[PDB]
Amino acid sequence: CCELCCNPACTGC
């Protein structure tokens, strides 16, 4: 998770 994206690629917010 980066900020809002908790996907296994940081592209799922």
Side-chain angles (χ1 to χ4, degrees):
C1 308
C2 307
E3 282 180 90
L4 302 153
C5 288
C6 262
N7 229 6
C10 187
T11 329
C13 287

